[PDB]
Amino acid sequence: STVPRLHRPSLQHFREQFLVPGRPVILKGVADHWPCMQKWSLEYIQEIAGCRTVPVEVGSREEWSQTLMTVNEFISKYIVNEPRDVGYLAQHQLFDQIPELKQDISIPDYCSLGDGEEEEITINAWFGPQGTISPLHQDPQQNFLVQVMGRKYIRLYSPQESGALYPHDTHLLHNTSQVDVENPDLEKFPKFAKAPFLSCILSPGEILFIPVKYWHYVRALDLSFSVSFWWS
Ligand SMILES: COc1ccc(CNc2cnc(C(=O)O)cc2C(=O)O)cc1
Numbered sequence: 370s371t372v373p374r375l376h377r378p379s380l381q382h383f384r385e386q387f388l389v390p391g392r393p394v395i396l397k398g399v400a401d402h403w404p405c406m407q408k409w410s411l412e413y414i415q416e417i418a419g420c421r422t423v424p425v426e427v428g429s430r431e432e433w434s435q436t437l438m439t440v441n442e443f444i445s446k447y448i449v450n451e452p453r454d455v456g457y458l459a460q461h462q463l464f465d466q467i468p469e470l471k472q473d474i475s476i477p478d479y480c481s482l483g484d485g486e487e488e489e490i491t492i493n494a495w496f497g498p499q500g501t502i503s504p505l506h507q508d509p510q511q512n513f514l515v516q517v518m519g520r521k522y523i524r525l526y527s528p529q530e531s532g533a534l535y536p537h538d539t540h541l542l543h544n545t546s547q548v549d550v551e552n553p554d555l556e557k558f559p560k561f562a563k564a565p566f567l568s569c570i571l572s573p574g575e576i577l578f579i580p581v582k583y584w585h586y587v588r589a590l591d592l593s594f595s596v597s598f599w600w601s
């Protein structure tokens with residue numbers, strides 16, 4: 370079934386029906402008027418950030434590596450010029466690096482329902498072409514994933530389903546599923562087929578609440594820019 374969409378729910382409604390129980394929801398009417406929604410084109414990003422160095426993941430989390438290049442180089446090589454490989458400006462605190470871009474976003478008011486300090490909220494950029502794919506994984510904090518450019522297909526599995534997701538057994542990867550969500554090996558991972566899940570296509574202006582430790586899988590359907598807020 371699908372992730373519910375709610376227009377600007379009250380803090381109490383979000384707290385009681387989603388945050389405390391740990392249920393995903395898409396928040397509408399919250400980020401849809403942030404300046405990033407109209408301002409962030411490739412041209413604007415090049416103007417404000419083009420000369421800055423960013424980490425770039427090449428390949429798939431299959432070979433995989435991490436390199437460094439300017440935002441201009443990343444756009445030229447992995448977005449516009451028939452890219453030879455998938456490259457992803459992933460999980461980077463771009464707004465600490467470039468404060469002028471921080472003016473174009475806000476911290477969702479709902480974060481103030483957490484027990485942590487606003488100063489400790491981690492804001493990550495996720496800027497990449499169509500076709501970037503995460504592994505199915507879980508994170509140790511709450512998350513508001515804000516979609517700015519393009520759309521993402523997202524699949525969500527409750528932590529109650531962890532047994533059917535076959536986490537890696539190394540300590541380093543125990544938060545990551547061994548399963549390819551969209552083409553699972555059911556001969557090796559048979560419990561995966563009957564694990565229930567939620568899914569959605571997250572579109573610009575929408576915020577997906579990913580509860581702490583909820584398993585999530587993310588595939589970009591277009592040229593995409595998302596901003597995640599990791600909070601507690
Ligand atoms: C090289 O390819 C990848 C591909 C995907 C990834 C990780 N994917 C995500 C994880 N987490 C969040 C989140 O907000 O917690 C968002 C995304 C996302 O892609 O939007 C890393 C490298």
Ligand SMILES: [Mn+2]
Nearest residue numbers: 506507508585
């Ligand atoms: Mn994540």
